[PDB]
Amino acid sequence: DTSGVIKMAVKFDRRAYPAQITPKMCLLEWCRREKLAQPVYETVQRPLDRLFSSIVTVAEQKYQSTLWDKSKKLAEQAAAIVCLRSQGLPEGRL
């Protein structure tokens, strides 16, 4: 079952990665090596609180952080982390 949404409580911290290396980049490259569709991100907002989330779809499965972020870009990195971590894949961490 590739249904519903898989979630983890994660946040993107650039200090966890080498310079110019991000979870989004790592997820894109994993999809390219496995010849899967490229990841698709969809933005979720709570505009009242100035908050963002993102749901990423990879191999027909949706992934999303349980946490909310201050920007769309930061939320997308969090979604990519959930996708990588929940599958036990490397995310480019130091």
PDB file of N, CA, C and O in Angstrom, residues 13 16 21 32 34 36-37 39 65 68 78-79 82 88 91-92:
ATOM      1  N   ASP A  13      18.140  21.400   8.973  1.00  0.00           N
ATOM      2  CA  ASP A  13      19.166  22.219   9.609  1.00  0.00           C
ATOM      3  C   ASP A  13      20.398  22.157   8.714  1.00  0.00           C
ATOM      4  O   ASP A  13      21.016  21.109   8.592  1.00  0.00           O
ATOM      5  N   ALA A  16      23.634  20.331   9.404  1.00  0.00           N
ATOM      6  CA  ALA A  16      23.695  18.877   9.405  1.00  0.00           C
ATOM      7  C   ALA A  16      24.283  18.337   8.100  1.00  0.00           C
ATOM      8  O   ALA A  16      24.517  17.143   7.971  1.00  0.00           O
ATOM      9  N   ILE A  21      24.923  20.879  -0.084  1.00  0.00           N
ATOM     10  CA  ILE A  21      24.269  19.570  -0.151  1.00  0.00           C
ATOM     11  C   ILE A  21      22.979  19.579   0.673  1.00  0.00           C
ATOM     12  O   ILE A  21      23.000  19.930   1.842  1.00  0.00           O
ATOM     13  N   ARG A  32      16.758   9.549  -9.413  1.00  0.00           N
ATOM     14  CA  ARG A  32      17.393   9.453 -10.725  1.00  0.00           C
ATOM     15  C   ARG A  32      18.138   8.113 -10.817  1.00  0.00           C
ATOM     16  O   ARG A  32      18.058   7.421 -11.840  1.00  0.00           O
ATOM     17  N   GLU A  34      17.376   5.366  -9.271  1.00  0.00           N
ATOM     18  CA  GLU A  34      16.422   4.265  -9.272  1.00  0.00           C
ATOM     19  C   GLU A  34      15.474   4.336 -10.459  1.00  0.00           C
ATOM     20  O   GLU A  34      14.586   3.485 -10.598  1.00  0.00           O
ATOM     21  N   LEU A  36      13.048   6.445 -11.024  1.00  0.00           N
ATOM     22  CA  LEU A  36      11.702   6.735 -10.567  1.00  0.00           C
ATOM     23  C   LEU A  36      11.295   8.098 -11.092  1.00  0.00           C
ATOM     24  O   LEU A  36      12.127   8.835 -11.627  1.00  0.00           O
ATOM     25  N   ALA A  37      10.014   8.425 -10.989  1.00  0.00           N
ATOM     26  CA  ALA A  37       9.573   9.784 -11.281  1.00  0.00           C
ATOM     27  C   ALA A  37      10.317  10.774 -10.388  1.00  0.00           C
ATOM     28  O   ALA A  37      10.733  10.422  -9.286  1.00  0.00           O
ATOM     29  N   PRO A  39      10.659  13.731  -7.708  1.00  0.00           N
ATOM     30  CA  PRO A  39       9.757  14.034  -6.590  1.00  0.00           C
ATOM     31  C   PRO A  39       8.797  15.168  -6.929  1.00  0.00           C
ATOM     32  O   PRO A  39       9.170  16.095  -7.651  1.00  0.00           O
ATOM     33  N   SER A  65       6.519  16.117   6.959  1.00  0.00           N
ATOM     34  CA  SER A  65       6.943  16.248   8.353  1.00  0.00           C
ATOM     35  C   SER A  65       5.728  16.474   9.256  1.00  0.00           C
ATOM     36  O   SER A  65       4.707  17.006   8.810  1.00  0.00           O
ATOM     37  N   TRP A  68       5.987  22.124  11.317  1.00  0.00           N
ATOM     38  CA  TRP A  68       5.725  23.177  10.349  1.00  0.00           C
ATOM     39  C   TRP A  68       6.920  24.096  10.260  1.00  0.00           C
ATOM     40  O   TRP A  68       7.654  24.251  11.230  1.00  0.00           O
ATOM     41  N   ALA A  78      12.153  19.499   4.644  1.00  0.00           N
ATOM     42  CA  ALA A  78      11.676  18.613   5.702  1.00  0.00           C
ATOM     43  C   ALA A  78      10.963  17.403   5.106  1.00  0.00           C
ATOM     44  O   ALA A  78      11.200  16.275   5.529  1.00  0.00           O
ATOM     45  N   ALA A  79      10.132  17.631   4.087  1.00  0.00           N
ATOM     46  CA  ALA A  79       9.422  16.532   3.433  1.00  0.00           C
ATOM     47  C   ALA A  79      10.414  15.539   2.811  1.00  0.00           C
ATOM     48  O   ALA A  79      10.249  14.327   2.932  1.00  0.00           O
ATOM     49  N   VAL A  82      11.845  13.310   5.471  1.00  0.00           N
ATOM     50  CA  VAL A  82      10.922  12.241   5.847  1.00  0.00           C
ATOM     51  C   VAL A  82      10.975  11.109   4.821  1.00  0.00           C
ATOM     52  O   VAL A  82      11.050   9.924   5.152  1.00  0.00           O
ATOM     53  N   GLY A  88      15.008   4.570   5.160  1.00  0.00           N
ATOM     54  CA  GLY A  88      16.349   4.191   5.571  1.00  0.00           C
ATOM     55  C   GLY A  88      17.430   4.569   4.577  1.00  0.00           C
ATOM     56  O   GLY A  88      18.482   3.938   4.541  1.00  0.00           O
ATOM     57  N   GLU A  91      20.790  10.721   3.417  1.00  0.00           N
ATOM     58  CA  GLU A  91      20.262  12.040   3.056  1.00  0.00           C
ATOM     59  C   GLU A  91      21.381  13.052   2.950  1.00  0.00           C
ATOM     60  O   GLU A  91      21.130  14.252   2.865  1.00  0.00           O
ATOM     61  N   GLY A  92      22.623  12.582   2.988  1.00  0.00           N
ATOM     62  CA  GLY A  92      23.747  13.480   2.796  1.00  0.00           C
ATOM     63  C   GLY A  92      24.198  14.131   4.088  1.00  0.00           C
ATOM     64  O   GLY A  92      24.937  15.112   4.062  1.00  0.00           O
TER      65      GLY A  92
END
